[PDB]
């Protein structure tokens, strides 16, 4: 089997991208934020405390015949920018673009953090990381694409961000069409539960390239790129006026500014990740300050290839017995 399904930037900055995803019988569809840095699928629900709900489509489990409740089972995840969601748990049928799992753990939310309640747009997280980190006590529970896996004409999915622009997650097939020239693959280490991988360096602009491994990891559910502080004051003081802010949280740069391409290595291939792709537009409404889309890894204990990096490139994820990434340009 094979599913594939289009995804769109929740706004004009491409701060997150939603997918429709259809759980229950009848369906009920949700617009999920499939996140390859976490092994939840949960969702805003009938359950959801009514004032943490503001303006999401709900699941009703009450309203499918195939829900069953998973008895007992609760779960309580945060994620690395501290917003956070628990609840119990049902099975039922879950669709993504054609490809149909049945008896998949569907995490209905009792509570979501307010990050979650003030975004209308997203109606739950589909996790795409490594099932250990599956938060379901006390039986974990697997991942979509783990419960799929053996059924998928090719145990992959591929992930295809746009900028400014709808992409596509792929299921159990790689189309050749949705990429220029091949496919460079490199090695994964699943210990974390992350998609994490070594890049092999990167150059500014122009620049040189500069050859350091990068350990990080593939994350569509982050926004930005999060990498060394060095790797980012050398992007940063490329864009005159770009200064790092304690106050804002981050390198913000002059509206102005014409921002330099940033290169990352993949073995011996190269991702180009324009400028333009860099900017998150101004820091507040009518503020000639911009945010940056490259930051300092320093704070988190890891470096993060997110969406800025990853909508550069055709994303293979490949869940082989030894998983591996790979990357194309496109």
């Known amino acids: ?50 004032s943490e709900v503001d303006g999401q489509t709900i699941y009703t489990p009450s309203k499918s015949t195939t829900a069953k409740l998973l008895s007992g089972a609760t779960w309580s995840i945060s994620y690395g920018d501290g917003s956070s969601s628990s609840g119990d748990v049902y099975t039922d049928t879950v669709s993504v673009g054609g490809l149909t799992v049945t008896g998949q753990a569907v995490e209905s939310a009792k509570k979501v953090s307010s990050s979650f309640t003030e975004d209308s747009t997203i109606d739950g997280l589909l996790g795409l990381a490594f099932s250990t980190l599956n938060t379901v006590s006390p039986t974990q529970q ?3 694409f783990d419960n799929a896996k053996a059924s998928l004409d090719s145990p992959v999915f591929t992930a295809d961000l746009g900028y ?24 994964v280490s699943t210990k974390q539960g992350f998609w994490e991988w070594t890049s092999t360096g990167y150059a500014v602009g122009s620049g040189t390239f500069k050859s350091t491994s990068i350990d990080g990891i593939a994350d569509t559910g982050t926004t930005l790129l999060y990498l060394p502080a060095t790797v980012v004051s050398a992007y940063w003081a490329q864009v005159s006026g770009a200064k790092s802010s304690s106050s804002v949280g981050g ?47 320093a704070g988190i204990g890891i470096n993060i290839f997110g969406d800025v990096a990853l909508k550069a490139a055709f994303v293979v994820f490949n869940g082989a017995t030894t998983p591996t990434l790979g990357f194309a340009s496109k």
Do not use: M
């Open 1 to 50: 089997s094979t599913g594939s399904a289009t995804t769109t930037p929740i706004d004009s900055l491409d701060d997150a991208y939603i997918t429709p995803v259809q759980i229950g019988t009848p369906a009920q569809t949700l617009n999920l934020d499939f996140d390859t840095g976490s092994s939840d699928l949960w969702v805003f629900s009938s359950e959801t405390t009514a």
């Open 164 to 187: 400014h622009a709808p992409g596509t997650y792929n299921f159990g097939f790689i189309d050749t069409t949705a990429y220029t020239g091949s496919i460079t693959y490199t090695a």
């Open 251 to 297: 390198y913000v740069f002059p509206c102005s500014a014409t921002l330099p391409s940033f290169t990352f290595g993949v073995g011996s291939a190269r991702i180009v990740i324009p400028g333009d792709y860099i900017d998150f537009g101004p820091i507040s409404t009518g503020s000639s300050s911009c945010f940056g889309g490259i930051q300092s890894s």
């Open 142 to 144: 697997k991942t979509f």
